[PDB]
Every structure is written in C-alpha cells, then in structure tokens.
C-alpha cells in the first residue's frame, strides 16, 4: 500500500475525543488533495488511516483505541506535524 | 512495500549530526529484531530508512538532507517515540 516515500507533512488542526474513538483533522498540502475521496488511505506517521471527510484542505480520520495505544498518534497535540503519504 | 500497519513504537536514543547527514539510533521492540539485517528497510514514522547498523536492540539509520527537509524526522529529539514497521 505504501512506499515509505513521505510526500510531505500535515498539521494536526483538531482532535475530537468522542465516546469510543478520536477524530484527527489534518491540514494536507495542496498537492495531496487532488483526487482524494472519502475511503482513501493516508498513512499518518506510517499509520494507515481512512479518509472520512474532506472540507477544503482539512481532512478527517477516525482513530480507534487500539491504533492510539500501538502507535504514537495517541501523543500528538493540536499543532503537531505528521508525515503523510497517500496510497 | 509497507502496509501501514504499525508494528510498534521505538525510542529515539541518539542523534549524531554530521555533514550532511544525521544518524538516528532507535531502540526497536524485541519482536522486530528477528531476521533484521543491515540494508533492510524500516519505516520511521512512515519514512523508509535503511538499516546501517545493529547492536543489540539499537538500530542505526542515516538520514539525508532531503529526508530531513520533507519529513518531521528533523524535529525529533532524543527520547521521542517513532512508529516503526519492517518491510
Ligand atoms: C486500509 C486500512 C485502513 C485503516 N484505517 C484505519 C482507521 O481509519 N483508523 C484506525 O484507527 N486504524 C485504521 N487501520 C488500522 C491501523 O493502521 C492500525 O491499527 C495501526 O497501524 C496499528 O497497527 C487501517 C488499516 C488498514 C490496512
Ligand atoms: C528503499 C528505500 C530506502 C531509503 N533509505 C533512506 C535512507 O537510508 N535515508 C534517507 O534519508 N532516506 C531514505 N529513503 C528516502 C526517504 O524515505 C524519503 O526521502 C522520505 O520518505 C521523504 O520522501 C529511502 C527510500 C526508499 C524507497
């Protein structure tokens, strides 16, 4: 799915804690928005996540508790930069 | 080459700045050491790097100027945890 050739960084502009998961909103680079549809896989810091929503260059993903515990995505704070790569 | 199923996190234990490049030494989880050889590829926060050295659990990578520029790996500090996945 992924080459490990990161295409750029994206700022975490938002974290919604909901009852069973977290939504991360990231601001993607313009050159990554082209042809991006909901359901597409983007790896965040190497972790595969599914696009749930697109508002402009603001892209949403839903993170389960297991993803948060196994990876460092549990420790991000708003304003952090994540490596991003579409598949 | 990578699936984006992160296999775990690795502590950045050492950063050795040189000319141009920068060596990162990370402490890999035990279950990732088996069969790991120099020249092998591991994605660090989604960024594919080549194993340059293995000493116990301590795995070295050399990070080139472009990699530091495109990714967030330039901002890491000793003690940070990185997502890691072997190919
Ligand atoms: C195609 C694909 C899509 C995935 N999408 C998500 C997701 O939206 N949210 C999530 O928490 N995990 C997702 N995962 C699992 C996530 O990548 C995995 O839990 C972490 O990498 C920890 O191994 C996905 C995995 C694959 C293979
Ligand atoms: C098989 C493979 C091995 C790579 N090894 C390294 C490496 O050892 N050091 C490095 O700085 N970049 C390496 N890269 C490039 C690096 O992944 C890339 O510059 C960043 O992901 C930013 O796109 C490699 C790329 C591939 C595809």
From Swiss-Prot, chains A, B:
Annotated Lumazine-binding repeat ranges: 1-87
One of the protein's GO biological processes: riboflavin biosynthetic process
Gene Ontology molecular function terms on file: riboflavin synthase activity
Residue numbers binding 2,4-dihydroxypteridine 2: 48-50, 62-67
Coiled-coil regions listed in the entry: none
Record's function text: Catalyzes the dismutation of two molecules of 6,7-dimethyl-8-ribityllumazine, resulting in the formation of riboflavin and 5-amino-6-(D-ribitylamino)uracil.
Protein name: Riboflavin synthase
Organism: Escherichia coli (strain K12)
